[PDB]
Design a protein around this ligand. Structure first.
Ligand SMILES: N[C@@H](CCC(=O)N[C@@H](CSCc1ccc([N+](=O)[O-])cc1)C(=O)NCC(=O)O)C(=O)O
Ligand SMILES: N[C@@H](CCC(=O)N[C@@H](CSCc1ccc([N+](=O)[O-])cc1)C(=O)NCC(=O)O)C(=O)O
Lengths: 231, 228
């Protein structure tokens, strides 16, 4: 019913973010939302109560997962999939102000930003999730599965590390380094919520990925980021 | 390979893929539908070409597909999702026609939603399902069930979306699409993977009728046939 009444009286403006206090993809969206100055409220869904199975929610997000965002100012447009939401945001912020904050107005740069973005949503997140699953939630213990995904997650972090190290190397010919166009974009941010959980599968970023550590730290010091991870 | 790079083309595209990568063919399909002239370089994992230095420069993730937009000073683009967004975007900027795309930000977010859904929730699960059924060191039914079920849940979502679309259309043999009653990279991104799920015991024809029709319409497209 909680979800019901809300869809009975939705704000004519602003944004509503459906998330979960455990969903990194949710906090990922909160961060961007916060960095762009977008005012919004969060509705943490109780999966225990099966609220994510509520008809009103499946309408918003047919995949019945989080995050899902509602752009009220746009006739209550519903955007699901964190990657889709990030793009909708940087695009909307750009057409409105003329400044491609956390984005780019150059086609080539966007292709670069998207690459890291899809890589994060397609190869980073799913893997951390499969690792966590066998390590902690499977119906039985399967060391080989845990090792498969743990390795993979290490492999993907190696690509990011190597990339960051490469960017640093280039500028030499603890200064902050970024994935695309020497500027903070949604590319860098997408990884932040996750970097904070991989410890749970035995990965020690600070130690095994020095570049990723500095990187995450620079981002962890931004007001908007802190605000999001607290809300 | 090494040669190719020092003797790279001035215009067009070069698609690095693999005979078994649905991801790669997804790009070829879009490349074709958009009329972009391109050549494909199939990497044999045997010789470990995808591990080679020059390729990693194109794709740090050392995976296929990767794409070189020669007209843009050999711009390197990796991750099938990003490559698709790059193509529709470039096509639109050049002709002022959102083919397989859209000029409405609302429609774009929906297309992007289905696109991310396909690349982050469809392909990864199919791939895991394949691994545990055919290539894992040990045979484990629980792992296989985990992924086959999830893939079946994903299709259900799509099947439902399409069914709701057919529902509306009827107010009756016509094609139905995910977004804007028009074919887009959102519909196309599932095509190659659709033709692969049978390898994990899923019969689309019987289990997902609307997905069967939908797939059929795309499979009958000439641009699609060629690419494949
Ligand atoms: N591709 C979608 C994936 C969304 C997704 O995986 N959502 C998960 C939460 S993030 C996965 C996750 C949850 C918790 C942790 N953790 O460390 O505690 C890590 C990852 C969910 O809704 N789960 C509810 C359910 O199905 O029951 C996107 O990026 O938006
Ligand atoms: N998120 C990336 C994922 C790319 C990816 O997974 N690439 C795979 C090939 S498609 C994976 C695949 C192969 C075969 C089937 N099949 O059904 O036969 C399905 C999927 C690769 O390069 N693999 C190198 C390797 O083998 O190490 C993207 O969307 O582009």
């Amino acid at each position: 019913s909680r979800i019901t009444k809300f869809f009975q009286e939705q704000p004519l403006e602003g944004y509503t973010l459906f998330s979960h206090r455990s969903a990194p993809n949710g906090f990922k969206v909160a961060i961007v939302l916060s960095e762009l100055g977008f005012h919004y409220n969060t509705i943490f869904l109780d999966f225990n109560l099966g609220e994510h199975r509520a008809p009103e929610f499946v309408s918003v997000n047919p995949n019945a997962r989080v995050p899902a965002l509602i752009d009220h100012g746009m006739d209550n447009l519903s955007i699901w999939e964190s990657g889709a939401i990030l793009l909708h945001l940087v695009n909307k912020y750009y057409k409105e102000t003329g400044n491609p904050l956390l984005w780019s107005d150059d086609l080539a740069d966007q292709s670069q930003i998207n690459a890291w973005l899809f890589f994060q949503t397609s190869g980073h997140a799913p893997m951390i999730g499969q690792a966590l699953h066998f390590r902690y939630f499977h119906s039985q213990k399967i060391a080989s599965a845990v090792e498969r995904y743990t390795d993979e997650v290490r492999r993907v972090y190696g690509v990011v590390e190597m990339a960051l190290a490469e960017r640093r190397e280039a500028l030499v010919m603890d200064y902050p380094v970024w994935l695309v166009g020497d500027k903070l974009t949604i590319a860098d941010l997408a990884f932040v919520p996750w970097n904070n959980v991989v410890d749970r599968i035995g990965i020690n970023i600070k130690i095994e990925f020095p570049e990723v550590y500095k990187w995450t730290k620079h981002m962890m010091r931004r007001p908007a980021v802190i605000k999001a991870l607290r809300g």
